[PDB]
Amino acid sequence: SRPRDCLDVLLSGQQDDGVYSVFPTHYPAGFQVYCDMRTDGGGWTVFQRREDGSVNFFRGWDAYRDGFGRLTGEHWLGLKRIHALTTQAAYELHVDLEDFENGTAYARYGSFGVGLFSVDPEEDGYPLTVADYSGTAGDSLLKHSGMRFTTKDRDSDHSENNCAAFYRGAWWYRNCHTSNLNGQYLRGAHASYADGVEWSSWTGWQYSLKFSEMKIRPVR
Amino acid sequence: SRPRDCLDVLLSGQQDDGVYSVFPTHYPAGFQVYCDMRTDGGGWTVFQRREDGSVNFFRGWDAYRDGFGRLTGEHWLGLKRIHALTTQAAYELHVDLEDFENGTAYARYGSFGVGLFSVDPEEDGYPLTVADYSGTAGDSLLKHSGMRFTTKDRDSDHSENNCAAFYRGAWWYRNCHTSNLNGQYLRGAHASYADGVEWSSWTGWQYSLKFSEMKIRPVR
Amino acid sequence: SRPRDCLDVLLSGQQDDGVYSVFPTHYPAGFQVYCDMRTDGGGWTVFQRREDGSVNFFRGWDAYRDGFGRLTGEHWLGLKRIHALTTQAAYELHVDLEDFENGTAYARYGSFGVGLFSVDPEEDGYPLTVADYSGTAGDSLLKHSGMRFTTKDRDSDHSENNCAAFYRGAWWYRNCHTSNLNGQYLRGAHASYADGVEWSSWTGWQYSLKFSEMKIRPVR
Amino acid sequence: SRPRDCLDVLLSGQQDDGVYSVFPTHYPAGFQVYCDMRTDGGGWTVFQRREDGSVNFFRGWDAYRDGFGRLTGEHWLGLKRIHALTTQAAYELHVDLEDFENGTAYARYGSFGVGLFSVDPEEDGYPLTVADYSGTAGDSLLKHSGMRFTTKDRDSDHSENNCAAFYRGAWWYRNCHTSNLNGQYLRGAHASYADGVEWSSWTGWQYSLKFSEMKIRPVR
Numbered sequence: 001s002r003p004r005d006c007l008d009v010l011l012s013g014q015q016d017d018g019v020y021s022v023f024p025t026h027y028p029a030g031f032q033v034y035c036d037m038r039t040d041g042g043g044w045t046v047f048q049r050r051e052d053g054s055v056n057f058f059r060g061w062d063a064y065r066d067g068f069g070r071l072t073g074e075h076w077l078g079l080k081r082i083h084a085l086t087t088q089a090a091y092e093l094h095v096d097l098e099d100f101e102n103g104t105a106y107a108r109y110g111s112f113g114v115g116l117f118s119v120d121p122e123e124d125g126y127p128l129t130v131a132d133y134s135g136t137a138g139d140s141l142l143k144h145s146g147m148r149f150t151t152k153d154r155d156s157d158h159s160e161n162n163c164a165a166f167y168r169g170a171w172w173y174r175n176c177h178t179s180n181l182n183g184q185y186l187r188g189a190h191a192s193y194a195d196g197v198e199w200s201s202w203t204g205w206q207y208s209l210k211f212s213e214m215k216i217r218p219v220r
Numbered sequence: 221s222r223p224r225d226c227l228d229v230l231l232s233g234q235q236d237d238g239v240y241s242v243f244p245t246h247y248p249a250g251f252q253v254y255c256d257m258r259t260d261g262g263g264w265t266v267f268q269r270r271e272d273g274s275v276n277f278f279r280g281w282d283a284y285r286d287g288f289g290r291l292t293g294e295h296w297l298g299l300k301r302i303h304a305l306t307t308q309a310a311y312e313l314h315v316d317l318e319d320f321e322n323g324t325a326y327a328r329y330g331s332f333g334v335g336l337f338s339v340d341p342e343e344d345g346y347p348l349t350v351a352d353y354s355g356t357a358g359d360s361l362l363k364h365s366g367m368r369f370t371t372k373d374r375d376s377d378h379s380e381n382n383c384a385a386f387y388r389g390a391w392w393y394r395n396c397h398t399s400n401l402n403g404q405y406l407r408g409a410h411a412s413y414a415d416g417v418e419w420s421s422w423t424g425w426q427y428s429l430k431f432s433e434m435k436i437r438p439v440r
Numbered sequence: 441s442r443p444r445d446c447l448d449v450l451l452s453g454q455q456d457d458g459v460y461s462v463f464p465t466h467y468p469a470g471f472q473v474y475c476d477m478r479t480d481g482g483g484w485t486v487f488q489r490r491e492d493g494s495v496n497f498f499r500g501w502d503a504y505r506d507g508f509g510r511l512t513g514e515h516w517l518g519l520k521r522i523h524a525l526t527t528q529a530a531y532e533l534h535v536d537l538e539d540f541e542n543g544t545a546y547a548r549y550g551s552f553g554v555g556l557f558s559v560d561p562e563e564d565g566y567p568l569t570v571a572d573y574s575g576t577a578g579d580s581l582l583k584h585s586g587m588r589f590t591t592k593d594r595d596s597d598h599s600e601n602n603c604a605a606f607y608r609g610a611w612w613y614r615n616c617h618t619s620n621l622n623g624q625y626l627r628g629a630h631a632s633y634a635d636g637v638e639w640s641s642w643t644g645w646q647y648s649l650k651f652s653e654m655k656i657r658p659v660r
Numbered sequence: 661s662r663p664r665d666c667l668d669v670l671l672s673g674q675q676d677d678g679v680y681s682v683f684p685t686h687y688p689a690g691f692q693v694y695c696d697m698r699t700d701g702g703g704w705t706v707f708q709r710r711e712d713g714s715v716n717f718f719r720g721w722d723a724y725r726d727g728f729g730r731l732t733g734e735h736w737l738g739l740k741r742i743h744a745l746t747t748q749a750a751y752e753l754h755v756d757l758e759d760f761e762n763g764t765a766y767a768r769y770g771s772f773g774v775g776l777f778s779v780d781p782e783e784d785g786y787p788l789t790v791a792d793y794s795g796t797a798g799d800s801l802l803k804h805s806g807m808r809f810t811t812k813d814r815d816s817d818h819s820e821n822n823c824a825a826f827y828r829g830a831w832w833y834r835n836c837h838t839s840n841l842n843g844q845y846l847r848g849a850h851a852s853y854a855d856g857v858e859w860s861s862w863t864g865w866q867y868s869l870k871f872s873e874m875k876i877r878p879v880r
């Protein structure tokens with residue numbers, strides 16, 4: 001009756017993809033999430049999805065903290081929820097990507113967490129922890145490990161300017177990025193530099209992907 | 221001990237109309253509501269009621285979010301509560317109306333929900349979902365399906381102006397409405413245009429109803 | 441393990457006066473209160489106490505909502521807590537008073553409640569409901585029944601001015617009062633008019649009491 | 661499954677030092693803390709730690725209320741959490757200190773609490789209660805008993821000026837201090853007066869300690 005995440009939902013007998021209620025350890029009121037019950041056995045809890053550019057992702061700090069969009073479409077679950085999920089157990093991250101040629105690729109990370117040991121995850125900037133890559137899209141996230149989350153109105157990056165504003169996104173920017181999945185939905189090749197839905201290791205710095213989905217599942 | 225809504229209250233043995241405590245899935249602290257234990261078998265949870273114009277309904281965003289008025293009289297349960305109720309199960313909507321000639325009519329909708337898949341229902345504007353009409357008052361809500369909630373201080377409608385201000389109410393306005401149950405209590409026929417407690421399909425655009433009650437009950 | 445109030449605490453075996461944890465129905469996190477386990481069998485939950493003028497009671501709306509002072513001394517439990525307590529069951533009110541001549545008296549009310557049917561008790565002003573008097577101090581509260589709570593910075597009374605400011609207190613003012621237990625601790629007879637810790641029916645309008653305690657216990 | 665503090669965690673079978681989830685009585689959502697499972701039998705819940713000056717401790721009221729830093733390094737658990745912990749049972753305080761010569765000392769207090777009887781601990785200033793000293797570092801906290809917590813932006817001390825600003829810290833200042841563990845990490849001897857990580861009874865008023873850790877464990 002109180003699954004902690006999508007894997008619990010799956011193990012309880014729910015095999016279909018869809019929206020379900022989960023109740024993280026330190027977020028007892030619970031909330032709804034979209035569950036991917038197919039990928040590599042299923043049981044993944046989605047926290048990000050781009051697919052048509054219908055939702056504006058160039059949002060400020062509060063929106064990225066609380067979440068926006070809709071579970072059945074493009075959305076960002078919200079950093080407070082991602083933190084509540086990732087700190088209750090050891091999780092891995094799966095990232096699915098797709099270009100405008102119907103081609104697809106993915107990146108899997110053995111460990112993933114946000115503000116794992118932060119007393120106040122929000123004030124500490126929801127620092128990213130991620131490692132152990134494997135997949136077909138190549139790694140475009142490891143260099144971001146250890147970085148705080150930065151938005152257009154809250155700079156915690158390692159650049160003289162605001163990476164989020166500069167690359168029109170919101171991410172665990174360093175100086176500045178190798179991945180920018182919350183960037184502008186520019187739809188394919190574009191002249192501007194690395195300010196679209198980018199995953200450099202796969203499609204470079206000037207190609208805004210058509211689809212992306214970030215999700216997690218207990219490592220053990 | 222922890223009914224999720226008025227139907228649970230009824231099924232537990234409480235047959236009288238009145239105020240009871242309910243505890244929605246993602247609103248564990250719970251809150252009180254007025255239960256209609258008579259209508260078509262009973263078990264309806266009320267979230268809106270007009271009956272004498274003693275309460276001001278031309279309120280702003282925060283009031284419509286948190287609720288106002290009193291459970292035993294005119295009131296609006298609050299969008300955050302309606303969301304917590306409607307997303308925990310599939311509900312239908314029953315609307316009771318009465319004119320100043322003691323005549324009455326109703327509208328029943330097979331499905332009803334507010335911000336059903338919104339990650340942050342408040343930021344997403346508590347979008348309305350409603351369908352499958354049947355009744356005696358005629359349908360005045362279907363054209364509103366899919367619309368966000370709009371108040372005098374937060375415009376999310378499809379009009380060049382602010383529908384809530386223009387028609388002195390708060391509703392899931394399009395451009396602008398076919399129903400306006402949270403409008404001014406003008407008491408019957410009135411010269412102003414569609415800015416009273418209107419339900420066009422039944423009493424037209426220039427007649428402010430004497431009584432209205434909106435309530436929900438699990439569909440299945 | 442989860443008493444709803446001081447009577448539950450008593451019935452569970454705790455016979456000594458002191459501070460205990462209680463968990464109201466719609467306030468699951470719970471909070472601490474001072475329990476009077478002696479008065480007429482014991483089991484009273486205190487929400488107000490004056491005894492030495494060490495605490496400032498001429499506070500604003502937020503302070504009266506959230507509470508101030510200390511449980512072991514002068515304090516105001518806070519309207520949000522009083523509401524959570526009184527709406528979970530039918531309670532009666534007991535008021536103990538003492539003048540500077542060591543004389544004492546009391547007022548008992550068969551029914552007592554704050555914002556009992558208010559959808560949003562705070563926005564509705566935590567309206568007072570009280571009736572059925574009996575005792576030795578005389579009745580100085582019945583005329584206040586039905587009134588909202590008023591502070592120096594939030595006027596909901598029936599006076600052309602702000603009763604709270606005028607009589608230096610915080611109360612369910614009408615126009616203005618017969619009781620003013622949250623008034624200034626003027627210590628006995630005073631020239632100013634009715635702006636001290638007054639209970640008119642007993643000591644008049646120009647005598648600030650030395651001690652007062654307001655508490656509740658389930659009626660049934 | 662729901663330990664109230666680090667002692668419960670230990671008694672349940674967890675013998676290693678590390679981060680664990682605890683769920684205080686009036687803070688049911690729970691939060692994570694660092695547990696010291698070695699000191700005098702183990703079972704201590706840490707709420708403060710200095711060790712390298714990597715974290716800024718000259719913070720304002722909200723930061724000291726909500727907490728900052730990281731559980732695995734320098735941090736302040738947050739006064740709201742310390743209050744939730746210390747009011748659920750009788751706790752004692754253990755303070756470990758270390759200078760830059762690798763020397764160490766400690767102070768143990770038989771009783772410790774923050775805002776123990778405050779109706780609104782935050783508005784009341786999280787007053788300190790502490791007594792019964794024993795140890796090797798000498799007592800530098802007893803004179804602070806009874807004092808409210810003061811930050812650079814919220815003065816509740818007994819000085820004509822703001823002790824927190826003057827001594828660059830945050831503490832239960834009187835006029836002003838004998839201990840200042842949240843002071844500037846000045847690293848050893850320093851010319852400025854008592855504005856570093858000081859514990860006067862041991863290293864005087866002009867020596868900023870290298871390491872400090874404050875923790876609690878149920879007295880009984």
Ligand SMILES: CC(=O)N[C@H]1[C@@H](O)[C@H](O)[C@@H](CO)O[C@@H]1O
Binds near residue numbers: 175176177178194205
């Ligand atoms: C996308 C991104 O962050 N690019 C880096 C760096 O790799 C580029 O060479 C540089 C060009 O100005 O901008 C940046 O600092």
Ligand SMILES: CC(=O)N[C@H]1[C@@H](O)[C@H](O)[C@@H](CO)O[C@@H]1O
Binds near residue numbers: 395396398414
């Ligand atoms: C009540 C309401 O929303 N009326 C519509 C439309 O049906 C009317 O014809 C029009 C008249 O200006 O106003 C509106 O845009």
Ligand SMILES: CC(=O)N[C@H]1[C@@H](O)[C@H](O)[C@@H](CO)O[C@@H]1O
Binds near residue numbers: 634
């Ligand atoms: C204490 C109090 O509220 N007194 C009333 C009324 O009884 C008095 O006669 C009047 C005198 O101005 O003030 C008031 O309006």
Ligand SMILES: CC(=O)N[C@H]1[C@@H](O)[C@H](O)[C@@H](CO)O[C@@H]1O
Binds near residue numbers: 838
């Ligand atoms: C650290 C501290 O609080 N010192 C006290 C007092 O002991 C000193 O003598 C005095 C010197 O001005 O400052 C202070 O008021």
Ligand SMILES: *[C@@H]1O[C@H](CO)[C@@H](O)[C@H](O)[C@H]1NC(C)=O
Binds near residue numbers: 100101
């Ligand atoms: C790509 O896939 C879609 C369905 O997902 C299909 O309709 C389309 O014809 C395919 N080809 C391209 C290049 O769009």
Ligand SMILES: *[C@@H]1O[C@H](CO)[C@@H](O)[C@H](O)[C@H]1NC(C)=O
Binds near residue numbers: 320321322
């Ligand atoms: C209407 O009904 C009320 C009672 O609900 C009754 O008192 C009244 O006489 C009836 N007729 C009219 C037109 O008011």
Ligand SMILES: *[C@@H]1O[C@H](CO)[C@@H](O)[C@H](O)[C@H]1NC(C)=O
Binds near residue numbers: 540541542
């Ligand atoms: C009143 O009672 C107190 C104890 O409560 C006592 O000390 C005192 O002598 C008594 N007389 C007066 C008038 O204070």
Ligand SMILES: *[C@@H]1O[C@H](CO)[C@@H](O)[C@H](O)[C@H]1NC(C)=O
Binds near residue numbers: 760761762
């Ligand atoms: C002090 O202890 C550390 C290890 O904790 C050690 O490396 C060092 O050599 C010791 N001596 C000094 C004075 O640093």
Ligand SMILES: [Ca+2]
Binds near residue numbers: 155158
């Ligand atoms: Ca920057």
Ligand SMILES: [Ca+2]
Binds near residue numbers: 383
């Ligand atoms: Ca508009």
Ligand SMILES: [Ca+2]
Binds near residue numbers: 596597599600601602
């Ligand atoms: Ca007034």
Ligand SMILES: [Ca+2]
Binds near residue numbers: 816817818820
């Ligand atoms: Ca001062």
